Structure 1
């Protein structure tokens, strides 16, 4: 059977979790905001020669119950910790998300990628590349800026996340 890599979109409200997902799933992007409850997408893709399926869970950046949030997290295998480079508060918000992910998954090496979206709005930047790169290094994860609008690195983040998930599976089995 085809391997299945479960990706979870994590990050504050409005950082562009949905935009990235939809851009990746259907090569589309709309400028208008659309609050997310919880959507599940699946797609057949080729990862280094093998046909696999990627499963993405796109949820609201704002969830009332911690128990529900944990049920979202616990179902994933890899995470895309998204924050917007045009809003510093969403960058600060990443530390808690990571802590919750670690607690819930109980593993320091959980497939995780730090993602700074909205790179096409360089003019409005609020978080510096270095700030982000530093946080990633101290968390021992990679950092990558994307733009779900222009597609810059959209495929890269999902495919790289898949590769780390595929690695942990390679060893942990």
Structure 2
């Protein structure tokens, strides 16, 4: 039965750990956001075909350029993540994440994932960006970034509302099948 290694990369601001807990538990962790998501596997059916999905977190590695690539060999698909309310995290897709993923895994599919969709419409979030002369990342910005890095999909999601969350991981599996 086909086994899929999926590694989640991106800035601290994406909320990678919270994304994986929310997906795998089908609930925002709410009260307390755990710092640890240990290597995970579950059977998940996509288009009738059962698949064993492996998920690795990389939270804690954001500052260790030579440690992060130890996780990359034999990856079947990458989620390269940015927060839709962190223009710095989006630009880091181009500056940091795509280059090292492509250097180490030149033929491995990438899903570009915009997280924190729930906050793109948040008045307080929008105002805090406005004070820095910034705005949230919009849908065509993600499409244009996806095209530039060769991502097979651009997908937007919220761990809070679960909006688009299941689709991310379905499309990671589809990128490999």
- TM-score, scaled to structure 2: 0.83
Aligned length: 162
Pair 1:101-2:101 in alignment: yes
Asked if 2 retains the 8 angstrom alpha-carbon contact of 1:45 and 1:54, the reply is yes
Match of 2:136 among 119, 126, 130: 126
Q: 1:112 matched to which residue of 2?
A: 110
Deviations 1:92-117 (A, max 9, x none): 1111211100111133xx21111101
CA distance in 1, matches of 2:176, 2:50: 15
Distance 1:140 1:105 in 2: 13
Work out the CA distance in 1 between the residues paired with 2:17 and 2:41.
Answer: 14
> Greater shift after overlay, 119-128 or 11-20?
119-128
Instruction: Supply the distance in 1 between the matched residues of 2:79 and 2:106 (Cα, whole angstroms).
Output: 17
Whole-angstrom distance in 2 between the partners of 1:82 and 1:34: 19
After TM superposition, the structure 1 stretch with the greater mean CA deviation from structure 2, 6-15 or 54-63, is: 54-63
TM-score, structure 1 as length reference = 0.85
Contact 1:118/1:147, CA 8 A, preserved across alignment: yes
Q: CA RMSD in A?
A: 1.8
TM-aligned CA deviation for residue 34 of structure 1: 4.1
Cα drift, residue 161 of structure 1: 0.9
Which structure 1 residue ranges, 5 or more long, are not aligned?
167-173
Match of 2:59 in 1: 60
